[PDB]
């Protein structure tokens, strides 16, 4: 048969190209050339062609030769898989060490040696942290296991896989070296977040959600459990981080591996089309697509025998980047997979020309094409015109294997459903809707009677004996004991908080149905749950979040216990807000979700049920004064002083029958205060117990996801180190503690305010637009000053009032100040304090620096040579410009220099010339102020409103003057700029248009 002949030819090609370097004993092929080193990602991608050939050969059964060939191919794949698994098992200690405190020095080595499975490179001469490699390893292992191949083999290997899944699940808040193992464009020993890593980790987690690694013969003890919260967080960071490549890279060609056949980890097909169009426009060439803009790999310069390039890449790599046909093969795979036929034909025709023949006329795919050193200026002046030459590894295993797989799929010998038994091709199908079920439970008989009187039918905590309701901390402790082994020294999953998507699904433990309340409602963890308005609104947010994604199979279920804390002052009826909320739920609509109230037994018929198979079987004078003192605030102060002097954990001996430690007394005081609902000492108690807001790291990472900088406390020059990369919970807590210092209230206030911005960003990402950096101390001082102005009180009174407000009050006031709603001088103060700048300000500043020698800001200087080092889209531009412009500590003067730079840019747009000198904004604003004073004196103004700023020498009327108008500050600023330009021009004007 002709098909048999074609299959034999393909098998011969595979044997001649890839399988000839099988490297027995271990089974890990060398990464081409004279390297003698094995890469996990390279081998995993190379084995794809062999797996596809084996799958194709398996169909033509009933013959000894074909069966033997298919068996040999499958067993070679299995041998490679086992070799890689042994290689990863060699570093269980490193994996376990990385499981706590994620650091670059605790991750397993990405570079692995040849046979004998040893380490070829130490822990400091290479970047041994690449989540992409282990992620694609897990994903393809799951795919082959679902296909029918047996790879995962023992319970110990299952435990190792579970531990490695726990290790990789934290990919959405850690820095990575990327696929290229070089971090950002400049190596400099730095790492940054990458979209490919997080997306492919999400795909790997989704693939292994409930896979039985032992096949059809496996039991409940050989399954892998993966939570859904991490997958949704990864989906979120991918959605919020995919208008570009990463924080520093505007576009990277490896983004195809996320929006194509590899792992299919993307939704919102319009985003996929936009990304493909962008990469086609900005990367395609005559011999493939470049890896990314401004890359120095394989160039005739920059001393190829060197590393850690200095920042001098204005043009040396621009428009001369090498092109890789591997992304062309990725394009043909993407076209041939989903629905495209003509794209596959055109891309195959394009790729056939760039191919280079080998021994016996075998096709070979070169690694990359490089521009000859002689024809560099021609390429610079005429892009994509010169002819490149083959270079790099001629038999590129990755590219050749991908091309072979694509050709095999295009020829029709293989189907898209064979390589993807998990049906990941339909990840872009829109989700119609989802219905969320809620259940309301009463703790005691009185609550149930109260809701019965109010027309609400419910069931108490009792009378549901088969069903048990426990807090989410219990569930956290449950999941902490997963994948624990003593022989392998495995500590299991580290303790972590559980989101709504984890507690919603039902759990079966010891043949008993277990339901868990949402984690937020724990009053002991934090006092945020005390406020009823806060409660109702974040329940709205929680319901919205649950109904948004719900990527898990089955219907959801929410259990709501009505405690004794939200009752009225008389303690006889429910509050108005909770009653309105439950009435809304009874009507089938709350927030943005459809809800049907019912019984737990009714919801038990259909829901998301999970089975946990792994749990089958004078000091005395001070004490007397504290006991006898009134004025509970003074009591809290005395408790603080005794705790800090000599009461860390020592017993106070207040009682005689029982010895109660200081912690017990503090807990009792907190409980007593919780019933009076007096926000006068809750903050101090919270600071003393050092309670930290749950999911603080999640808030930090979702805030940093949108290219923002965070800062804690009032700013002096030395302290307040900026935050630019995600950091673990311990480091974050230590940083906020050192920022708060001895105040002990700055820390809790910072936590509350920052979780508030984190909550507000997801709901409304429009108030934080055109922000770049968020400074917590400055906004703290801002709201303190606003409270002082509103109450016409002192700073201390403003602070006590601010402390005394309810959490809903802080949320409302921060929302108000974020909108900037409620004089002109005050408004300028708020603008400067929060450093509000227009969106196009940075393009204007870049153009001004291009057209001017420099800018003087009354101190230091900003050279114009930085425009070549730097681009408008770079966050380095943001940090440098902000650092230059924040030397003046006056919000008003800050806004003055913003408007001065704006009018200077308008003038530079008007006049077509080169200034050729350093311009000082301080001189311009001083000249404008002098002109305003002269105009006021001429008009007839007296000395009382001709005031002088005690620290800046600027008239108050200038601040109070509106920006626009016949006598607005803008006209005076333009006049001052024109006077300066005339003073720095050759006795004439060069303004024409």
């Amino acid at each position: 048969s002709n098909s048999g002949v074609r299959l034999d030819g393909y098998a011969r090609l595979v044997q001649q190209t890839i399988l000839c370097h099988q490297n027995p004993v271990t089974g890990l092929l060398p990464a081409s050339y004279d390297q003698k080193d094995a890469w996990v990602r390279d081998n995993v991608y190379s084995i794809l062609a062999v797996w596809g050939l084996g799958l194709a050969y398996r169909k033509n059964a009933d013959r000894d030769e074909d069966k033997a060939k298919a068996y040999e191919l499958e067993q070679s794949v299995v041998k490679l898989m086992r070799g890689l698994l042994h290689c990863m098992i060699r570093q269980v200690d490193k994996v376990e060490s990385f499981k706590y405190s994620q650091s670059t020095k605790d991750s397993l080595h990405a570079k692995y040696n040849t046979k004998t499975c040893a380490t070829v490179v130490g822990d400091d001469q290479w970047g041994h942290l690449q989540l992409d490699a282990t992620s694609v390893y897990l994903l393809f292992l799951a795919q082959m296991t679902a296909s029918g191949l047996h790879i995962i083999h023992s319970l110990d290997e299952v435990n190792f896989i579970q531990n490695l899944v726990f290790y990789i699940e934290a990919a959405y808040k850690t820095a990575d070296f990327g696929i290229w193992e070089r971090g950002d464009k400049t190596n400099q020993g730095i790492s940054e977040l990458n979209a490919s890593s997080v997306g492919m980790a999400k795909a790997a987690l989704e693939a292994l959600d409930e896979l039985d690694l032992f096949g059809v013969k496996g039991g409940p003890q050989s399954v892998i459990h993966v939570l859904a919260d991490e997958v949704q967080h990864c989906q979120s960071i991918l959605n919020s981080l995919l208008p570009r490549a990463s924080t520093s890279k505007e576009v990277d060609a490896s983004l195809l591996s996320v929006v194509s056949f590899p792992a299919f980890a993307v939704e919102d097909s319009q985003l996929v089309e936009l990304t493909k169009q962008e990469i086609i426009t900005k990367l395609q060439g005559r011999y493939g697509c470049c890896r990314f803009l401004r890359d120095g790999y394989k160039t005739p310069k920059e001393d190829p025998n060197r590393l850690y390039y200095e920042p001098a890449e204005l043009k040396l790599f621009e428009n001369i980047e090498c092109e890789w046909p591997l992304f062309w093969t990725y394009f043909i795979l993407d076209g041939v997979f989903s629905g495209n036929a003509e794209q596959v034909q055109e891309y195959k025709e394009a790729l056939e020309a760039v191919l280079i023949k080998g021994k016996n006329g075998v096709p070979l795919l070169p690694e990359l094409y490089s521009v000859p050193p002689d024809r560099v200026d021609e390429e610079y002046q005429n892009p994509h015109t010169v002819d490149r030459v083959p270079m790099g590894k001629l038999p590129h295993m990755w590219g050749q294997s991908l091309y072979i797989l694509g050709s095999l799929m295009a020829e029709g010998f293989l189907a898209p459903g064979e390589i993807d038994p998990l049906n990941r091709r339909f990840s872009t199908v829109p989700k119609p809707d989802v219905v969320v079920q809620v259940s309301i439970l009463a703790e005691t008989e009185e609550i149930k009677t109260i809701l019965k009187d109010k027309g609400i039918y419910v069931e108490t905590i009792a009378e549901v004996y088969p069903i048990r309701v426990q807090p989410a901390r219990i569930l956290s402790h449950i999941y902490s004991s997963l994948g624990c082994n003593n022989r392998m020294k495995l500590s299991g999953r580290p303790y972590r908080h559980m989101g709504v998507l984890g507690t919603s699904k039902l759990y079966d433990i010891r043949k008993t149905i277990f339901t868990f309340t949402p984690q937020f409602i724990d009053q002991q963890q934090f006092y945020l749950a005390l406020d009823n308005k806060m409660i109702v609104e974040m329940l709205r947010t929680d319901l919205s979040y649950l109904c948004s994604r719900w990527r898990m199979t089955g219907q959801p279920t929410i259990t709501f216990p009505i405690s004794h804390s939200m009752l009225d002052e008389d303690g006889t009826s429910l509050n108005s807000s909770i009653l309105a909320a439950l009435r809304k739920m009874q009507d089938g609509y709350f927030g943005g979700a459809r809800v049907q109230t019912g019984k737990l037994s009714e919801f038990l018929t259909t829901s998301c049920c999970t089975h946990l198979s792994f749990m089958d079987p004078d000091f005395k004078a001070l004490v007397l004064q504290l006991k006898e003192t009134s004025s509970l605030q003074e009591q809290a102060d005395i408790l603080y002083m005794l705790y800090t002097m000599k009461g860390p954990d020592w017993n106070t001996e207040l009682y005689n029958e029982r010895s109660a430690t200081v912690r017990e007394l503090l807990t009792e005081l907190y409980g007593k205060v919780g019933e009076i609902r007096h926000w006068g000492l809750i903050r101090y108690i919270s600071g003393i117990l050092r309670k930290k807001v749950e999911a603080l790291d999640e808030a930090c990472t979702d805030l940093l996801s949108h290219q923002k900088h965070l800062t804690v406390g009032l700013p002096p020059e030395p302290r307040e180190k900026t935050i630019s990369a995600p950091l673990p919970y311990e480091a974050l807590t230590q940083l906020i503690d050192e920022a708060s210092e001895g105040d002990m209230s700055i820390s809790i206030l910072t936590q509350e305010i920052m979780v508030y911005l984190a909550m507000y960003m997801r709901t409304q990402p429009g108030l934080f637009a055109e922000m770049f950096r968020l400074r917590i101390g400055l906004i703290i001082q801002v709201m303190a000053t606003e409270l002082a102005h509103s109450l016409r009180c002192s700073a201390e009174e403003a602070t006590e009032g601010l402390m005394n407000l309810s959490p809903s009050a802080m949320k409302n006031l921060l929302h108000h100040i974020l909108s900037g709603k409620e004089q002109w001088q005050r408004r300028r103060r708020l603008d400067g304090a929060l450093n509000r700048v227009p969106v196009g300000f940075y393009q204007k500043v870049w153009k001004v620096l291009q057209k001017c020698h420099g800018l003087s800001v009354e101190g230091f200087v900003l050279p114009s040579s930085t425009t070549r080092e730097m681009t408008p889209g770079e966050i380095k531009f943001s940090v440098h410009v902000e650092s230059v412009l924040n030397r003046v500590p006056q919000p008003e003067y800050r806004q003055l220099l913003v408007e001065a730079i704006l009018v200077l840019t308008m003038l530079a747009d008007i006049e077509i010339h080169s200034i050729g000198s350093i311009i000082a904004v301080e001189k311009i604003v001083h000249i404008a102020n002098d002109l305003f004073l002269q105009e006021q004196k001429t008009l007839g103004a007296d000395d009382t409103m001709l005031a002088k700023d005690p620290a800046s020498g600027i008239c108050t009327l200038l601040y109070d003057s509106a920006p626009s108008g016949r006598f607005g500050t803008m006209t005076y600023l333009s006049k001052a700029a024109a006077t300066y330009v005339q003073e720095f021009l050759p006795h004439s004007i060069c303004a024409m248009q």
Binding site: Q22, P24, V25, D64, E65, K67, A68, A70, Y71, E72, Q75, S76, V78, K79, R82, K115, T116, H153, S154, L155, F214, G215, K217, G218, G219, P220, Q221, S222
Partner: protein, 234 residues
């Protein structure tokens, strides 16, 4: 860190027997597969340890001597050689014969141990090395060498019997199981088997030159070998 080969083979035997006993049930709760693995993994570890020494096999083929023999004790954590030739000898062919015979037994019962053709070639060269057992002395199963224990090697009946049984089992056997073709079989020279039988059938009543009788003859004429088709002599 030391780990012998015979003990691992017998542990794999126990695991395989327990898996076979469990196979009689339809609902095993994923237990038969685990023990079947355990056997597979032990066999694959032994095979990998042997494959790590190919030049040793090549030297054994040409000039079989105790100084150029395969090691019998490897590291339990990394699969590395631990003790040199000057302290252990490492000349033991009974372990190799038992490994080959047990691999035959497991494949015949139905298993997947050998993956690629290179493993088939290595097994064939191992059989080539074993075919010349009847001339070289060995330290024996007891790794002492003789009763005197003076670092002297001598021919042993048990080793010869185990080698003969392994050659009989590896004759024409297909290493690929049911999913095999004509290019996955092992060939055995008849003259080597005849020489081994001639060397065994005459020294069988004793154990060796210095041993009138030994307990190590029991495995040679019992369950693991069954290499004595004489009845009266047995």
């Amino acid at each position: 860190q030391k780990a012998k080969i015979q003990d691992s083979l017998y542990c794999a035997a126990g695991a395989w027997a327990l898996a076979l006993a469990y196979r009689r049930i339809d609902d095993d709760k994923g237990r038969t597969h685990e023990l079947e693995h355990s056997a597979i993994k032990c066999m694959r570890g032994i095979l990998y340890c042997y494959m790590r020494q190919a030049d040793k096999v090549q030297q054994f083929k040409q000039d079989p001597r105790p100084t150029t023999c395969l090691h019998s004790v490897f590291n339990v954590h990394t699969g590395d050689e631990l003790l040199s030739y000057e302290e252990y000898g490492h000349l033991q062919i009974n372990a190799v014969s038992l490994y080959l015979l047990y691999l035959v037994e497991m494949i015949s019962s139905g298993l997947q141990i050998i993956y690629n053709t290179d493993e088939v070639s290595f097994i064939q060269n191992l059989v080539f090395c074993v075919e010349r057992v009847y001339r070289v002395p060995d330290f024996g199963v007891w790794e002492r060498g003789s009763k005197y224990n003076n670092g002297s090697t001598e021919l042993h009946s048990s080793s010869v019997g185990l080698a003969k049984a392994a050659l009989e089992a590896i004759n024409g056997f297909n290493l690929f199981g049911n999913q095999g073709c004509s290019w996955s079989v092992i060939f055995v020279d008849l003259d080597a088997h005849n020489r081994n039988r001639q060397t065994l059938c005459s020294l069988l009543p004793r154990e060796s030159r210095s041993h009138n009788t030994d307990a190590a003859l029991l495995p040679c004429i019992s369950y693991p070998a069954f290499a004595l088709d004489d009845e009266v002599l047995f």
